[PDB]
Amino acid sequence: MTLRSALLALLSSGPLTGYDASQRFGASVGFVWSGSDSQIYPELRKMEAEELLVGSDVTEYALSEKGWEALRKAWYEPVTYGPTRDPARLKAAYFEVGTNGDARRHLRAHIAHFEQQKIQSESMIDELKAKTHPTLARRLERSPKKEHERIVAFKVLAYEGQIARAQAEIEWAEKGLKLLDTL
Amino acid sequence: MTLRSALLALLSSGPLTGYDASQRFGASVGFVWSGSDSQIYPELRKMEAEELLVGSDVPWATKTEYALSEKGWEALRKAWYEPVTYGPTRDPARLKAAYFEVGTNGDARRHLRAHIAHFEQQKIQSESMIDELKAKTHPTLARRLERSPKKEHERIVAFKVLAYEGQIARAQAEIEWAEKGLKLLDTL
Numbered sequence: 001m002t003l004r005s006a007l008l009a010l011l012s013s014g015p016l017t018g019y020d021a022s023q024r025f026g027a028s029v030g031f032v033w034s035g036s037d038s039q040i041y042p043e044l045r046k047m048e049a050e051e052l053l054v055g056s057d058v059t060e061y062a063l064s065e066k067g068w069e070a071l072r073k074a075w076y077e078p079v080t081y082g083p084t085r086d087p088a089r090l091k092a093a094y095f096e097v098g099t100n101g102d103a104r105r106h107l108r109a110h111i112a113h114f115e116q117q118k119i120q121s122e123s124m125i126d127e128l129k130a131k132t133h134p135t136l137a138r139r140l141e142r143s144p145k146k147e148h149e150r151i152v153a154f155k156v157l158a159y160e161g162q163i164a165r166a167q168a169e170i171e172w173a174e175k176g177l178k179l180l181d182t183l
Numbered sequence: 184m185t186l187r188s189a190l191l192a193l194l195s196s197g198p199l200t201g202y203d204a205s206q207r208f209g210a211s212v213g214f215v216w217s218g219s220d221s222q223i224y225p226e227l228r229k230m231e232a233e234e235l236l237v238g239s240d241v242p243w244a245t246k247t248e249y250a251l252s253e254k255g256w257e258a259l260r261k262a263w264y265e266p267v268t269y270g271p272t273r274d275p276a277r278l279k280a281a282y283f284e285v286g287t288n289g290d291a292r293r294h295l296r297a298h299i300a301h302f303e304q305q306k307i308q309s310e311s312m313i314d315e316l317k318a319k320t321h322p323t324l325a326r327r328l329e330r331s332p333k334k335e336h337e338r339i340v341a342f343k344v345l346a347y348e349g350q351i352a353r354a355q356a357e358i359e360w361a362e363k364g365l366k367l368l369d370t371l
């Protein structure tokens with residue numbers, strides 16, 4: 001359902017073949033809602049069967065009127081917050097299963113993972129503000145000019161959220177490394 | 184695989200029937216790695232079939248009580264030693280925010296206010312869990328401490344606390360992010 005919503009959002013930037021959709025998805029919205037080539041391809045086919053997409057041969061998918069309607073309905077609805085599935089938090093809760101040295105290794109890897117995430121998110125923000133990110137560029141060319149500021153600002157906001165979470169994860173792991181000094 | 188690791192960790196606090204495991208899981212490790220009753224029951228059956236768990240029929244009708252075998256203790260230690268694999272992000276609120284232009288700024292403010300309320304509630308839950316952990320009376324923690332050498336008790340508790348401090352850290356970051364989004368929406 002949520003993968004469908006992310007595909008509707010992606011396809012509102014313009015029509016795409018399944019292969020191109022898979023490529024553009026992973027370079028854009030896949031950073032906040034991941035989807036692989038084996039998930040995207042059958043969902044696109046299902047959305048076409050449910051008449052949310054129109055298929056045209058160039059096999060290239062475009063939103064139908066029902067697809068635009070489904071996009072707007074999906075966004076209007078409140079977020080349904082799923083339960084937490086955090087492998088690093090699970091690991092940390094049971095660090096006593098291993099050594100303090102193991103725990104430091106895990107916490108250092110946590111820091112490195114989210115420091116890399118921060119670099120990736122900040123680079124994405126640079127491309128969004130430069131308006132040259134390929135999916136954003138297509139979106140802007142097909143969007144009213146009065147909407148461009150909001151369109152870019154909300155993409156930036158999403159990646160600022162990735163950065164905020166990453167920073168909290170880094171400082172949490174730093175506090176854990178200090179905890180390990182004592183016990 | 185990760186659900187199996189969470190169940191091994193839970194059952195290292197002591198043997199449990201599947202029903203008791205289900206209830207205890209949801210009030211302990213389920214707050215960091217969620218597991219439904221329909222996910223937990225078949226995973227325990229599989230773990231017993233693979234001899235990571237010993238099943239013993241107990242009066243409860245009889246029910247199967249699951250306990251770690253030596254193979255299960257080895258699987259638990261091995262699972263913890265391996266590096267974490269960081270899955271790809273699937274964050275519904277971040278996805279919503281990325282495409283707030285689908286609706287009105289009023290819709291977006293409603294979403295962001297809901298984000299704040301969700302994580303302020305999670306902070307209360309996490310802080311209450313830390314109180315129960317430090318009091319040593321959380322039911323799974325108490326069972327675990329009963330079966331653990333005294334020299335390890337402070338370490339055991341501290342790591343549970345550390346996990347929920349991470350839940351609080353994340354929740355606070357989500358609140359601060361949503362609050363800056365609300366300020367953005369003032370100007371857009």
Ligand SMILES: COc1cc(C(=O)[O-])ccc1O
Pocket residue numbers: 009010013027028029030031032124133135136137139155158281
């Ligand atoms: C949500 O992430 C993105 C979305 C878009 C888009 O759909 O225009 C472009 C770049 C992104 O990084």
Ligand SMILES: COc1cc(C(=O)[O-])ccc1O
Pocket residue numbers: 093192193196210211212213214215312321323324325327343346
């Ligand atoms: C990981 O979350 C918890 C774990 C335990 C435990 O296994 O002893 C107890 C309480 C918890 O909140």
